[PDB]
Amino acid sequence: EFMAIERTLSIVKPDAVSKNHIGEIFARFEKAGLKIVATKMKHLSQADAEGFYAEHKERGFFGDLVAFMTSGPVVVSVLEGENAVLAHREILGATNPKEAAPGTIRADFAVSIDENAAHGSDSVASAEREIAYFFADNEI
Amino acid sequence: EFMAIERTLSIVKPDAVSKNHIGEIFARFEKAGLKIVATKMKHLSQADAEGFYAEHKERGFFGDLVAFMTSGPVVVSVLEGENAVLAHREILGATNPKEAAPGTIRADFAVSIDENAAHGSDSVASAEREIAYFFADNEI
């Protein structure tokens, strides 16, 4: 092979979970060569959401963020493949559905940046943190 | 509504998990009106498999069954919708891929009855048992 095989965290956010887009979104991962090496549907508690987005507790958007990310069940998943992080974010599209490319998850399943269907790790380093927060290594 | 809303257990068996058909299979559930109200990828231990298929421990096929169902990771999921049990089994098709209808999961993702891509509860009563074996009720 050619690119390092990486692991990245996926969260199908509550909007997309309530609109039954899990399989569809999953399929797009799989189609693009990413493998699902862990996954679980979870109802986040406030403490769950806060702890995960701890890095932004002092931020303006934090409160609304936490309320949304706990408004309904999410699916957290670990994807794995060559160049996983960057290639995940390419399937998702820009964080803002307005700015996102055609045929991306953010373009087809999300309307606003407040509720953008999916979370992807933006870095290998954060992917390591973000993955370790939701999954024991045994669980993968 | 018209039919009782039921809950049924889904296992994407290891063949289909290794061939990256989760999203695709999930999508077919969702498309057909079934909602995923719980799910997790799990590597079954022998004791896991045996305990779940306990009803057939004295059967000829049991050993091969257990070895397959523990040969790779599976996804266990709880589906919910009107007439969930019977409508699940309709999307899956006949347990035997040979006898299964076009456009069913067993037809498109499975070759033999030994490795038939997916498990579905065949009854409301078993669905209650099968669901309670893999999921705490909190978890749903």
Curated annotation (Swiss-Prot), chains A, B:
ATP binds at K13, F61, R89, T95, R106, N116. One of its GO terms (biological process) is UTP biosynthetic process. The keyword Cytoplasm applies. It catalyses: dZDP + ATP = dZTP + ADP; a 2'-deoxyribonucleoside 5'-diphosphate + ATP = a 2'-deoxyribonucleoside 5'-triphosphate + ADP; a ribonucleoside 5'-diphosphate + ATP = a ribonucleoside 5'-triphosphate + ADP. The active site is at H119 (pros-phosphohistidine intermediate). It comes from Acinetobacter baumannii (strain SDF). PANTHER family: NUCLEOSIDE DIPHOSPHATE KINASE, NUCLEOSIDE DIPHOSPHATE KINASE DDB_G0292928-RELATED. One of its GO terms (cellular component) is cytoplasm. Pathway: Purine metabolism. It holds the Pfam family NDK. Its EC number is 2.7.4.6. The gene is ndk. This is Nucleoside diphosphate kinase. Major role in the synthesis of nucleoside triphosphates other than ATP. The ATP gamma phosphate is transferred to the NDP beta phosphate via a ping-pong mechanism, using a phosphorylated active-site intermediate. (Microbial infection) Catalyzes the phosphorylation of dZDP to dZTP, when the bacterium is infected by a phage that produces the substrate for the synthesis of dZTP (2- amino-2'-deoxyadenosine 5'-triphosphate), which is then used by the phage as a DNA polymerase substrate. Keywords: ATP-binding, Cytoplasm, Kinase, Magnesium, Metal-binding, Nucleotide metabolism, Nucleotide-binding, Phosphoprotein, Transferase. The keyword ATP-binding applies. Homotetramer. Its cofactor is Mg(2+).
